[PDB]
Design a protein around this ligand. Structure first.
Ligand SMILES: Nc1nc2c(ncn2[C@@H]2O[C@H](COP(=O)(O)OP(=O)(O)O)[C@@H](O)[C@H]2O)c(=O)[nH]1
Ligand SMILES: [Mg+2]
Length: 169
């Protein structure tokens, strides 16, 4: 038991939190998935020749008390902050998610990746540069993804893992 990585997926409702995690774990794209469902997913992967286990909480951000939600927030090593490129509101909402993570971790150095999802859609409302600058503002990687095509799906989770390794040394 050498390396396990605890990852948390956060972001506005309907940006593709669920779709992204399932696409990663089950290698399929989900049409519909209950927006109120918050669950943890485990899968063994090799990343850069190093076999490790990913332990990934897909957040739904409901109100009811969860002991598991709390555990992941406190012990979680890295966070995906997801918006959608066709959803200007979800992009504007990123800052709320960043600040909560800062508070939870009580630090400015928290492994994170900015992810722009639904990049397979022509109706973009959020420019590469827009997202690029925010991620630059935060000093974090920005990756464009599609849960429907798998574009960037591996790079999003793997980049985050790599961010976590840099935090280890
Ligand atoms: N075209 C497209 N649709 C997506 C993508 N990711 C998610 N969706 C769709 O967007 C909707 C919301 O996704 P969901 O995973 O439920 O979002 P969540 O609320 O953040 O968990 C669903 O109808 C998905 O099929 C994507 O990359 N491309
Ligand atoms: Mg969901």
């Amino acid at each position: 038991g050498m390396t396990k990585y605890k990852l948390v997926v956060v972001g506005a409702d309907g940006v593709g939190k669920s779709a992204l995690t399932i696409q990663l774990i089950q290698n399929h794209f989900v049409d519909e998935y209950d927006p109120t469902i918050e669950d943890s997913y485990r899968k063994q992967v090799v990343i850069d020749g190093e076999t490790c286990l990913l332990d990934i909480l897909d957040t739904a951000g409901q109100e009811e008390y969860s002991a598991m939600r709390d555990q992941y927030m406190r012990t979680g090593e890295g966070f995906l902050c997801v918006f959608a490129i066709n959803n200007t509101k979800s992009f504007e909402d990123i800052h709320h998610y960043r600040e909560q993570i800062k508070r939870v971790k009580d630090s400015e150095d928290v492994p994170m990746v900015l992810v722009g999802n639904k990049c397979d859609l022509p109706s973009r409302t959020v420019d590469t540069k827009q997202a690029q600058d925010l991620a630059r503002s935060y000093g974090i990687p920005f990756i464009e993804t599609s849960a429907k095509t798998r574009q960037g799906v591996d790079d999003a989770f793997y980049t985050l893992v790599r961010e976590i390794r840099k935090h280890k040394e």
